[PDB]
């Protein structure tokens, strides 16, 4: 798939962003991925989904700093 992490949410699932390194909100990250990055000390903002969406892990274009979790990279 086109995505390093590739889950892809429910509809009203539990979804992060970073205020400060988000591009903007709609730039996103899954619970595993948002509890393994640099982004769970920072000015983060939960979102919950409408459903259809997926996790923006690793997507270099989506965060002005740390794309990739520790697991992901
Ligand atoms: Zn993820
Ligand atoms: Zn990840
Ligand atoms: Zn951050």
Redesign the pocket.
């Given at each position: 798939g086109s995505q390093?992490?590739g889950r892809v949410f429910k509809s009203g699932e539990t979804t992060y962003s970073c205020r400060d390194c988000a591009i903007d909100p709609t730039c996103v990250?899954?619970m595993?991925?948002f509890q393994?990055?640099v982004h769970k000390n920072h000015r983060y903002k939960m979102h919950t989904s409408t459903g259809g969406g997926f996790?923006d892990?690793?997507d270099t274009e989506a965060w002005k700093t740390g794309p990739?979790?520790?697991?992901?990279?």
């Open positions: 390093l992490c990250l899954c595993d991925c393994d990055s996790c892990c690793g990739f979790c520790v697991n992901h990279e």
